Structures are given as structure tokens and as C-alpha cells.
Amino acid sequence: KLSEEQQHIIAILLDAHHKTYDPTYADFRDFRPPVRPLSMLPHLADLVSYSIQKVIGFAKMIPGFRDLTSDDQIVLLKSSAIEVIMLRSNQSFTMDDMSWDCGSQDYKYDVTDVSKAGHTLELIEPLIKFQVGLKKLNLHEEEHVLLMAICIVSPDRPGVQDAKLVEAIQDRLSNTLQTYIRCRHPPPGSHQLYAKMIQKLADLRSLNEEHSKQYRSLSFQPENSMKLTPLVLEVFGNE
Amino acid sequence: PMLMNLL
Ligand SMILES: C=C1C[C@H](C[C@H](C)[C@H]2CC[C@H]3/C(=C/C=C4/C[C@@H](O)C[C@H](O)C4=C)CCC[C@]23C)OC1=O
């Protein structure tokens, strides 16, 4: 059974996500337009930079997150940002044609579009696999916002100074997720759900290292870095 | 850091 406290955590996270994820995708209008070699780079940089902003907003609402030192906040967000973009995008991901569908043809991103941002099949192949895996878990929105939160507040990130504090927050988050599954997620959806979810977090780590490699290689070309946003360069292309 | 200011 969920405690009041645990219910309080979920309500907050659903409100946090709903404040920061717009399923009408109305803001996409503002991005540099998409063109269908590196013709999708300006549009997809804009999309990612916006999504970083939304992720920061979400992260801020996580119970305990604001109470961390400023430096630890930055470290958690810099390392997690792309992983949460990948988690959050599953909500626009469709298994009919393996694409992210954001309401209109112009904001429908398939494999070729991701390659026109400059990325290779070595990233794209595992990314789609991940999205199929995650979509087939049929997560409750409660589980989806908890997984994003647990992703962010990871004590085992390089650079983390107060790991015991980060861990204290993660555990409250983890036990909440675990208790939700048992008493609120019906079987056999509940069958091995938690371990599979934890396994997704490992996949993201791996996906992250492959994003980092391809991001470094591409944004070394100053012509490509120019096409980025200041926040992207600050979050990805820093240090 | 504009990240710091978004916090
Ligand atoms: C300039 C880039 C592109 C690359 C993006 C990677 C390859 C992936 C990760 C998630 C993918 C997508 C995510 C889709 C959305 C739309 C919506 O669901 C909101 C969500 O925040 C999101 C980013 C579709 C295009 C390629 C993306 C951005 O990383 C970079 O640094």
C-alpha cells in the first residue's frame, strides 16, 4: 500500500511533467524550419535545446532536487539531460513506422531525419530498439514520470559531490515506484516490471556514451557548433 | 551557466 507521502510524490511529478510536456506541440512553430546532409541539424538542435529547458523545469519540481547544492544540480542535469530527452520522447514515439509523431508531417521525425542531423546507425539502431522496448512496457504515466525522476537523481554520476544526499532522494523515488507497481499496477503488467525499468536506465547510460561520442565528433566542426544553441553547448559541449 | 539561472 502507498503511504500518503508516496502519493504526494506522484501527484507532484505528474503535475511537474504536465507543466513541462505539451502534447499539442504548439511551440515547435518557433524552431528553425526542418529541411527534408546536415539539413535537419538546426531544427533538431532547436528541438533538443527546448527539451533541455523542459527537463530542467521538471527536475526542479522533483521532491528534494532543489535542496541539493547548485553544483550537484548542474552535474545531474548535464549527465542526464539527453537520457531524459530519450525517455520523454517515447510519448511521441510510434511503432507503426518507427518515428516520433508530433502532430503534423513537418514535426514527424524518422530515421533518415535523425541521420540528417549528422548521427549514425550506431546510435540510431539502439535508440529505436530502446523506444520499442520502452513502448512495449505500456507504462502508466505514474511509472513514466518516476522513471524520468529516478534517471535524473542518480548518485552514481561522475562529478557528484554529495552522493549520499542524491541517494536519499533516489531511494524515496525508487520505493515509491516499487510500491506503485505492487498495489496499483495490475498483473501481468506488474510481472518483472521494476527490473525491466531499471534495465532501461542501463540502456540509457550506453545510449548516452554513444550520443556523447557522436556529439563530440560533430561539434568539433566549428561550422556545426555555430548551428547549435547556447544552452546545448553549455549542457552537452562543456568541459 | 544559463543552467544555473534556469534553477
Ligand atoms: C542535435 C542533436 C540531435 C540528437 C538527438 C537524438 C538523436 C534524438 C534523441 C530523441 C530524438 C527525438 C525526440 C523527440 C522529441 C519530440 C517530443 O517527444 C518531445 C521530446 O522532448 C523530444 C525531444 C526525435 C529526433 C531525434 C532525437 C532528438 O542529439 C543532439 O544533440
Nearest Cα neighbor of A45 from A222, A219, A171 is A219
> What is the rounded CA–CA span in Å between residue A9 and residue A138?
21
Closest Cα to atom 19 of ligand 1:
A89
Q: What does this entry list as its resolution, in Å?
A: 2.5
What's the angle, vertex CA A59, arms to CA A55 and CA A61, rounded to 5? Answer: 125
H helices within A62-120, ranges in order? 70-88, 111-115
Nearest Cα neighbor of A45 from A29, A34, A36, A37 is A34
CA of A46 from ligand 1 middle (Å) equals 10
Tell me, using a 6 A CB cutoff, whether residue A89 lines ligand 1. Answer: yes
Looking at residue A174, its amino acid is S
> What is the rounded CA–CA span in Å between residue A35 and residue A204?
28
Decide if A77 and B3 are in contact by the 8 Å CB cutoff. Answer: yes
Q: Is residue A40 helix, strand or coil?
A: coil
Each domain of chain A, given as residue ranges in start order, spans 1-239
Q: Give me A199's grid cell.
A: 534495465
CA-based nearest distance A234→chain B, Å: 7
Is the domain A1-239 a CATH 3.20.20.80 member? no
Q: Is residue A101 helix, strand or coil?
A: strand
Which chain A residues are closer than 8 Å to B1 by Cβ?
Answer: 74, 234
Contact predicate A113/A34, CB 8 Å:
yes
Q: Is the dihedral of CA A225, A228, A233, A237 positive or negative?
A: negative
Q: What are phi and psi of A107, to 5 degrees?
A: -115, 45
Determine whether A26 is exposed, middle or buried from the number of CB atoms within 10 Å of its CB (0-12, 13-18, 19+).
exposed
What's the angle, vertex CA A71, arms to CA A171 and CA A204, rounded to 5? Answer: 50
Q: Which residues contact A123 (CB under 8 A, 6 or more apart)?
A: A207, A210, A211, A214
Decide if B7 and A53 are in contact by the 8 Å CB cutoff. Answer: no
Starting at the earlier edge strand, list the strands of the sheet with A108-109: A93-94, A99-101, A108-109
B6 → closest Cβ in A56, A66, A78: A56
Q: Hey, which residues does A108 pair with through a beta bridge?
A: A101
Q: Give me A173's grid cell.
A: 523515488
Distances (CA, A) of A191 to A140, A159, A197: 14, 35, 11
* Start-to-end C-alpha separation, chain B: 10
Q: Which residue has the cell 496499483?
A: A184
> What is the rounded CA–CA span in Å between residue A43 and residue A45?
5
User: How many other C-beta atoms are found inside a 10 Å radius of the C-beta of residue A186?
Assistant: 8
Determine whether B5 is exposed, middle or buried from the number of CB atoms within 10 Å of its CB (0-12, 13-18, 19+).
exposed
Length of chain A: 239
To the nearest 5 percent, what fractions of chain B are helix, strand and coil?
Answer: 0, 0, 100
Which structural technique was applied? X-ray
Q: Which residues contact A205 (CB under 8 A, 6 or more apart)?
A: A83
Which chain B residues are closer than 8 Å to A77 by Cβ?
Answer: 3
Tell me, using a 6 A CB cutoff, whether residue A48 lines ligand 1. Answer: yes
Looking at residue A114, its amino acid is V
Query: Cis omega before residue A188 (within 30°)?
Result: yes
Tell me, using a 6 A CB cutoff, whether residue A109 lines ligand 1. Answer: yes
**Cα of A219 vs its chain's centroid, Å:** 21
A26: region left, alpha or beta (phi > 0 left; psi from -120 to 50 alpha): alpha
